[PDB]
Amino acid sequence: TLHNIITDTENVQGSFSKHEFQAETKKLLDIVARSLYSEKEVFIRELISNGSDALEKLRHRMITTAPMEIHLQTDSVKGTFTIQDTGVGMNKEDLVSNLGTIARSGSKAFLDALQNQAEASSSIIGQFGVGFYSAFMVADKVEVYSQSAEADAPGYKWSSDGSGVFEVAEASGVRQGTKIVLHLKDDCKEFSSEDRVKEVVTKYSNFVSFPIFLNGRRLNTLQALWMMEPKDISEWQHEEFYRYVAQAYDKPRYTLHYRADAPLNIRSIFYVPEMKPSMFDVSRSSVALYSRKILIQTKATDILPKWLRFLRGVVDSEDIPLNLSRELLQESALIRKLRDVLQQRVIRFLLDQSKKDPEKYARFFEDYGLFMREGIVTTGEQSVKEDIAKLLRFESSALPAGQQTSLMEYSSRMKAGTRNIYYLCAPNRHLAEHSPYFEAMKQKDMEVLFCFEQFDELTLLHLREFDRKKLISAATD
Amino acid sequence: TLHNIITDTENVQGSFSKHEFQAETKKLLDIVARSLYSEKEVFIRELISNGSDALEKLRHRMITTAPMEIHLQTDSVKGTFTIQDTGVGMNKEDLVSNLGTIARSGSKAFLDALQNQAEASSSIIGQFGVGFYSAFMVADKVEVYSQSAEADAPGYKWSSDGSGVFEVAEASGVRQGTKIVLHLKDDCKEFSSEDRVKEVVTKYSNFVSFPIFLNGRRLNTLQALWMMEPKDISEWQHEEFYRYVAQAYDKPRYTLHYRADAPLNIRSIFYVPEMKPSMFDVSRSSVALYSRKILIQTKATDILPKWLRFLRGVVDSEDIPLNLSRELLQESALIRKLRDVLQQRVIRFLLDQSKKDPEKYARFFEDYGLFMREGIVTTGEQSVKEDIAKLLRFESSALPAGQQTSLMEYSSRMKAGTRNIYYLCAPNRHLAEHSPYFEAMKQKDMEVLFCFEQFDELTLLHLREFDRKKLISAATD
């Protein structure tokens, strides 16, 4: 019944002509202005990232003093937004080449030149060569004044409406660094409001490693603690940071400050709140994803497994694959790897807490144990079920009332002939201890886990086995 | 305490030099190959869209016969994917200009030339001028053979590795139209598997308006019914289409085929299944978003309000704002407008069903009424609550048992002195009718709504008022 037309019929008839790929810059400008970003406000993120990059370059050539700052100014009656950094600036060649050429970035050349890259490569944000054009999403006119930190280089003014052409002229009175003035479009006047700009900086950019001022007021006093050496962060600093990133008023019960370079770059701080979890926490994460100190996503969907959604804090990775709009490239293998790494590290962290302070862990488990049970029921990977299962606590017939035990402690108490873990679910210990089911087990000198919570029975039935041992309900026959 | 540095100090010193924006094509190619699409499989979507566009152009110059088809061929041992269309093809100028220039599209020029655009503008998919380069995500070598439908124009071979350069030569034996051969990268050999390609076509492209064949087998027999005149679609065609798009085995209880041009373009079909809703339907949409017959999103997040997640079907709009990757540009005003339009139209549709066949509607309400109650509780907009409230059904003291009434029917029966709607929640009618609360009301000759479902009381308390009338529980005092 087949119907094909694909057939190998073609042969080349003439000499080949060689050609370079070209680009329609006017369309590209339009695409970047209208078809890349879902929200126009990210132009502020992009200009601040450029200011930071320029300052980072200056910091490196400070070997070889000057204040390294980013200033923002709003003027409502003028309808302008201005950003000025005290960074490396641009000479005429740089202005024409780097600003005038889409997809051209000064990042690679700066990094390559530096003898040792590691430190600078971590700090430099820009990689695509398009971020500057985000200005034209919101501005009818863009003027750039720049003065390079070179020998006796002159100052320059670069100007454009984003309509295919720009102009450059020598300029006097330009301070070292770069000032960008945006004359905002009529439908974008909100970015000449101080409160509005403050919200955008707080959202994306406040953890930038240089002071940001808005109309003279410091916006970003709080530092990116995740980058720092964990021992140099006091308990008080963690309380304060937790409250800020969690938008909370309580304090953290637990703090895990995790840094790794292998198998991927991770700089992270996680907190467990002291308050018991809300019904929206249980309903449905509040961990935010950063890359090189800039926000990528405010609520992970998802760099953590669902059952860890009770965690608060920040994960920063240099290795996050970004799309051109600087959102996450979805479901990359690196994200799945990151998620698995974090799950393993948090499980081990919580396990370590249960051994360091059982009383405190017990309080944690009363309140957050539901998430563990859910995590076990949710996955079909046995190794994951069994790892999360290590976090579970139960009472036991072999222990006095109120005393909690783990599956691992139970198993350590078994005898080598045996491969069954017995449990009995009941509203409370008195009824467990006086169940006919328990007397049977008691005859056989078999220890029984007592399970009073929900959904304890369902969890254990899902878990099925633990450490090669069958989970068997005593409440039968 | 202020600390500023932003000061108006600059003046231009020299003449301005004028410059055109330029582009670094090598970086752009890299960005498109690595930083745009979250899944490499969309190259198939993009090449098929191009085939469709080429065929649509041919269809128009058929005024002024030939079969209009898209063929795919996989060859596993060769590691190739081939697509050939019998469309308008490209001459040398077109090959060099359109394929060789990123962000350059032949769409505008074709549309502008046509005396009447409306029909063609609806059919033509391409707008950015980048889709072709998606081939380099998966191929090390791309060869294009094309023959224009012109007077005595010769055939051509265009060839590239996506490394900045390409070659063009005259070629013999090229059939009218365009054939593209991809030599797949080692990590992309899955696209030389027939089953894999079939999955991708089914996912994005099967509703394209031209037959698609894969290794000689027709893939897309089922047509995009949403575009058609509603009366030309039989009940049987709707059953079949419903089962396909809902991945279901039952049949639709209700069918709403909605087309509008104002205030925006909408071509849509919604179905309510006859089966009662599953626990994942209730847990958490299965309406898919299309644009010009190509998938944009398979599960709306979200073009419908949450409470309408029980609907199945397809919404197609020419007006969907797309980002460069051809995902939805998030939270555009047009999406919110679309959502509101659809909500209004579905509410009116269901209201019309309750009047056309109350018995059938009653069956619908038993099973799906939970979604209405949820929708009322979820929103804070009173006009929306009251519109969804029109869908609610209750028993009444003024009607015989089993008979259902609406809030509007209740209100029509009130007397002009009165502004209260009374209700009584109870497990069943017998207990309602014999409640002491009801006797009180019965004394005052006041009609009482009897509410046996959950969460009836909560819903009515949230609703608060209806048509300027207070909802008041009789179960007090």
Ligand SMILES: Nc1ncnc2c1ncn2[C@@H]1O[C@H](COP(=O)(O)OP(=O)(O)NP(=O)(O)O)[C@@H](O)[C@H]1O
């Ligand atoms: N404030 C600034 N100071 C100095 N140089 C700047 C400044 N802003 C932009 N540049 C230069 O202009 C180039 C283009 O900036 P931009 O379009 O943001 O691309 P990018 O920073 O290189 N990469 P990306 O932000 O990922 O798109 C930068 O690489 C710098 O070389």
Ligand SMILES: Nc1ncnc2c1ncn2[C@@H]1O[C@H](COP(=O)(O)OP(=O)(O)NP(=O)(O)O)[C@@H](O)[C@H]1O
């Ligand atoms: N199969 C084809 N037949 C004829 N012309 C084609 C074909 N494929 C590509 N072209 C031409 O090459 C141009 C570039 O294609 P492409 O890069 O997909 O951009 P586009 O279709 O115009 N817009 P978009 O798909 O939104 O990126 C098209 O506009 C056509 O002019």
Ligand SMILES: [Mg+2]
């Ligand atoms: Mg940048």
Ligand SMILES: [Mg+2]
């Ligand atoms: Mg295309």
